[PDB]
Design a binder for this molecule. Structure first.
Ligand SMILES: [Zn+2]
Ligand SMILES: [Zn+2]
Ligand SMILES: [Zn+2]
Ligand SMILES: [Zn+2]
Lengths: 372, 372
């Protein structure tokens, strides 16, 4: 057994930004009080991971990235009762302490114990469980999944169906985010018209969400036409490539939808796309949701007049879902209510992790995952 | 008596921007098809009226301003069935045609036949019913109330209780806007904490609104402490003057509401104050509503991060109310559910109209109204 013992395993470390991830042999210490050590079965590669490497999203280095995964509990530390060794779980980059204002609230999931603000890259006691070449390695949002074993706080684990498929790892971020953006944040209504900007893992998940919600028209907007067939198959009623157009994408959309769509979901993070998304909505009531993050300190030059006639601009993290709702998502997935696995376009090993980033960089596929 | 005849009367004409209004003798033509001529009984002076004069809000000149009033129908044009001579009414700067997209949707009141975008300053047939010193005079948003008699489209009039008090004119704009911003736009929930920035006609109405919505805490924010007493009397649980602190107002508010308020309403149109309002709301789910217009081409330097955690930024006109709901507001006022008259701090006659602009220009009291 490995309980109470340090584990040496493989992991993809980011020693510095703008550089390919380095595969290293690392040491994972045993879990401390209210911590759980998890054996990762599968991990996904998110755009967010790429953004940390590019320094778009602030982070300390060296660091082990990844926050989209499914695994099984290897051992638990003192005080843990929410899970036991052998339980299949999904790590939560947005924890659920259950006692903060956000957790007590029914309209928020932004638990105040998240590390997205402080960015300590360390456990609660300010120490690291990861060691490589005598050096402490920082974690990502209390998770880090680009490693065979990881340690997370017990308030950041979601127990799920023992038989859940490995593709279920997308529910750990990409799918919950896009799907939730349409169903929880925007709150797409039956018969409504929607537009999704950015056709990556999140965008496709948002398309699946708009369809689940009953939208009559779902417009996928992106610049990689090779993805359009896929988008249609998953629910989009049509796709638009802004590069084919000379006139603004939002004028094109408004002209095709009697003034604009009812709901727009921006999944690129670019200021331009955010602006295009907003103006693509009906001025009298359109709702726009932003999910991505722009560079360090870029700003959206917003004309208050665009909101005055009736528009709403919203944002959310993890699709607005609470950790206690992840299991329900896995259940629906296994009951075929949502085909998450349809979004997995590539399966790799941890050794090929850099290939996944290459696929993103280029801008193709849907979502690659790694099987450990 | 006057049906089918031109009426000679008094009106306050703005011959050009940045100058006091001129009291003139004008001629008002009889109503054409689907138009209604109204004898104004009382009119309020709104900040918006001041904005047109200072060119903050675009408009043609010469123009007769004013869009907050109550009057009685003097005569009707061919085909009018909704009202008859003698009916007490309130002109609507946001009409209700009943046929466009916004009118067919319950989630929008922005009737496409509004003149806020085209700014023609003319009737449906592109002619004016106002004549002064031999010149055709433009109107304001299909209304114009700084005149003893006016002509509006039959889709821009709301019949109300025959015994409605003169102070009912505030429902024409100021009151409906603020009260609605709280009840319909922000959708304030019982027990929540609210923040209202800008203590003018709209600001006070917003306070009354949060109170009626069941808020447990209502913070009034403005740099004129002489109004705080009134604010408290009408519903505010406390008031803050940004000039009594060295740190940003949003920090003082978050520091006092453990994270920020649930709902913030900006009633000034200043970019500065709009940003402060947004940051005064809880990051996990705060809702900010903007109601004012900044200079024609000012932009809000919005950082996406401020919304990503769960905040919403919304806007609306006429407080989200439909013309068909105006009569109900008047009923509640006469039943004493809402004391609109408490916002009236000055009563003048048409000749003193420039004094009301003076009071606003210096933020003296709440709202002034003229009795014709
Ligand atoms: Zn992510
Ligand atoms: Zn919490
Ligand atoms: Zn007004
Ligand atoms: Zn209409």
């Amino acid at each position: 057994c490995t309980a109470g013992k340090d584990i040496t395993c493989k992991a993809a470390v980011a020693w510095e930004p703008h550089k390919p991830l380095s595969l290293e042999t690392i040491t994972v210490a045993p879990p401390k009080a209210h911590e759980v050590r998890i054996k990762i079965l599968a991990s996904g590669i998110c755009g967010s991971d790429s953004s940390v490497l590019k320094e778009i999203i602030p982070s300390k280095f060296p660091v082990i990235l990844g926050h989209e995964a499914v695994g099984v509990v290897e051992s638990i530390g003192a005080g843990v009762t929410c899970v036991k060794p052998g339980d299949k779980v999904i790590p939560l980059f947005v924890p659920q302490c259950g006692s903060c204002r956000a957790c007590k609230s029914s309209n928020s999931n932004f638990c105040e114990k998240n590390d997205m603000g402080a960015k300590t890259g360390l456990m609660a006691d300010m120490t690291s469980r990861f060691t490589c070449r005598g050096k402490p390695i920082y974690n990502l949002m209390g998770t880090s999944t680009f490693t065979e074993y990881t340690v997370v706080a017990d308030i950041a684990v979601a127990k799920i169906d023992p038989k859940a498929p490995l593709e279920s790892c997308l529910i750990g971020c990409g799918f919950a985010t896009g799907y939730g953006a349409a169903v929880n944040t925007a709150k797409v209504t039956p018969g409504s018209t929607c537009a999704v900007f950015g056709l990556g893992g999140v965008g496709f998940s948002a398309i699946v969400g708009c369809k689940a919600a009953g939208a009559s028209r779902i417009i996928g907007v992106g610049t990689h036409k090779d993805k359009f067939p896929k988008a249609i198959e998953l629910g989009a009623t049509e796709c638009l490539n802004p590069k084919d157009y000379d006139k603004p994408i939002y004028e094109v959309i408004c002209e095709k939808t009697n003034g604009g769509v009812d709901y727009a979901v921006e999944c690129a993070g670019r200021i331009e796309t955010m602006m295009n998304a907003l103006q693509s909505t009906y001025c009298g009531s359109g709702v726009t949701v932003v999910l991505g993050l722009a560079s360090p300190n870029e700003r959206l030059p917003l004309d208050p007049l665009l909101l005055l006639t009736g528009r709403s601009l919203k944002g959310s993290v993890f699709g607005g879902f609470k950790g206690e709702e992840v299991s329900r998502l896995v259940d629906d997935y296994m009951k075929k209510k949502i085909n998450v696995n349809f979004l997995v376009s590539t399966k790799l090993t941890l050794d090929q992790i850099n290939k996944a980033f290459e696929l993103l960089s280029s801008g193709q596929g849907v979502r690659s995952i790694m099987i450990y």
